[PDB]
């Protein structure tokens, strides 16, 4: 939601995420990407716990 | 300082003089037994 | 350290009067390998043993998490625009050749 | 540039990863870190990681301590004392890991009192490696002969009281060492006589009954002589309740 | 070409100055003193590097 706002697209390019868009990709979206990658990855470890 | 720490768990947390004698003269009486054997011996007349 | 002559039961007497004792909380004794060779006691409180191993399972568990990381998008834009300084250089030594 | 930016990447990752472990278990902090170096590691030169190989492997585990672990140890070889270094035989192949090392009386009693034999200490020959134990803080399990690698122990501050058991003459083999004088200064000499008393009769006319015997007045007073009668003194009872 | 067998293996990673360092060895061991050779056990032969 925050992200196409820009125009970039998030694509779930398989386990990992990614964004698809022209060019660069804006920093606060290259963080919060970032941030939702460590939670699903913290987020699987706990679920296997 | 192994004395002082003796001192110290007879006087609680302070070294006063009364701790201080007190872990001394406890130190002597802990190897006392052969002494205190002795003595006891002489008492009884075995060793006269 | 107890001195006497034997069947005195000094083993027995002194583990009931030991036993009497109390002790706050004697902190979980663990081994942690600070390499693949070296081996280091570590002291926890009563309880943190589970959570520790519980947090190293996971970690243990954070290398596919880590190698799904090395595909992500930022990941691949940063090796392609290395990739892409280094094909400029080789670029320039090419042109000066060619 | 490729090794240096996965690493970086890796480190920066691992960063947040471990950040809220340490303020959990902040004690084990170098721990975490090395194994954050190997993670690091698995980054740069891709080599695999052992999960059995990078575990806590624990030894201990007290409810409050009350009573505190009093870890009885008759016996004085090394692997009862220090535990021993179990291994993997891989067809011929000696291999261990931090998961395989078995806890030692040491290792039980931290926090506690270990309890050992004088005599066994110095008849199985550890009494040098317990002196160092005790005074430095490094205890090495048993490593095998066969083995390509052991394990190196780091050293730790040890917090058990050692309480030694031994008869008197038992003892006179580690009392002539400087360095047992510095380690144990408290010698609690049991008496091997008591003043034979009526206190001391009825004292140990409450030790029998507490025994799970019933004593009649006459039998308690035959008893008295005869415990008077071993120790072969008019004034003094044998203080050997054993033989009683 | 073996990798392992070409690579610098670090000994000392001090890069501090005050203390210098100070190695307390009590137990005065071949082993401890002047190190111990680590050997690869590959198919019962005691390869080392």
Known sequence: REAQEAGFALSTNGERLELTGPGPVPAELSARLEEVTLGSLAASAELEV | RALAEEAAVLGGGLLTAESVEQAIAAREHRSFLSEEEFLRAVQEGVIR | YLVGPPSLGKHEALLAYLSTQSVETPPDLLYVPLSERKVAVLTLPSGQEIHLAEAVEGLLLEVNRLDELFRQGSFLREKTQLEARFKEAREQQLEALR | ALRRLRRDWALHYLNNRFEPLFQRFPQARAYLEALRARLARYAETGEPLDPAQWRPNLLTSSSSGTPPPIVYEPYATAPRLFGRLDYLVDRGVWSTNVSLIRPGAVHRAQGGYLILDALSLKREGTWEAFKRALRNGQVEPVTEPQAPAGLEVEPFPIQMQVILVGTPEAFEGLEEDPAFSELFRIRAEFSPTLPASP??????????????????????????????????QRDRMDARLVEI
């Open chain 4, 199 to 232: 206190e001391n009769c009825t004292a140990l006319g409450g030790w029998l009954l507490a025994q799970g015997f019933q004593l009649t007045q006459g039998g308690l007073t035959r008893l008295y002589d005869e415990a008077r009668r071993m120790a072969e």
